[PDB]
Amino acid sequence: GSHSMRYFFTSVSRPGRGEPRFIAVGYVDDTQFVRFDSDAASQRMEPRAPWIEQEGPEYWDGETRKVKAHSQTHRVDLGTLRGYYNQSEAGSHTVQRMYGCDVGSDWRFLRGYHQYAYDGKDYIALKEDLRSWTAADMAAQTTKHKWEAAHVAEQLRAYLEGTCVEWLRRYLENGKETLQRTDAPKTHMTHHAVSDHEATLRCWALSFYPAEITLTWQRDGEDQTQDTELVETRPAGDGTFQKWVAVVVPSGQEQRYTCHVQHEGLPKPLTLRWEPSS
């Protein structure tokens, strides 16, 4: 299928004392594979998947130097942004950055991205063309002009279309046993009386990977959203994901309702119905 490599960085200023808290995480698809936390003892980029531990000491040294350099860029950014927005030196502020690349089923480049936020709002982002910048406000417009004069988008485009894709393909190969394995959802339906006249039917999808999934209810073959509840997809804690969808129904009418499950790991979507003797 399609694949992606993404890096996420958050720095939070600490006005009372010291440097910002900095946390970096790298993912291949929905699998975390590296991390850096400025509060941790190692002060190194650390592995979080078995297939990345295959990499040699030059890799780990290089990733640690680069991730610490990202932390210092965020530290300078926080100071600059405080000045741009004429803010007090007393408050805590946040910078977030995400970048990465997507590839298709053939592992060729599809799309690249590089985006920044300040205090949880868009600040500046590279456009889909990997040439231009989207500045959300006039402070970001100043950054945009500076970056247009310093050839920044060219270097980012070269990384996103080149290096990013090349390392993604290397990791997909090295970690094939898990990264190229699809875990189809393990599905079941539960029934919970809500009164002596009605009951909730809950359609579960467990232990699946990747996270992308669709759960829909139908009544007599047509989509149903009234009296339904769909929870956000959530991590199981072992690398897989979970989700459920529920519908409130008149008791005795359970057979009209079907839950439909769509996922990359299923050749054909699944259909579930309540088994009345369950």
Partner: peptide
């Protein structure tokens, strides 16, 4: 692998 960007705000 990480980039070495010059995205200084």
């Amino acid at each position: 692998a990480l980039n070495t960007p010059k995205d200084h705000i």
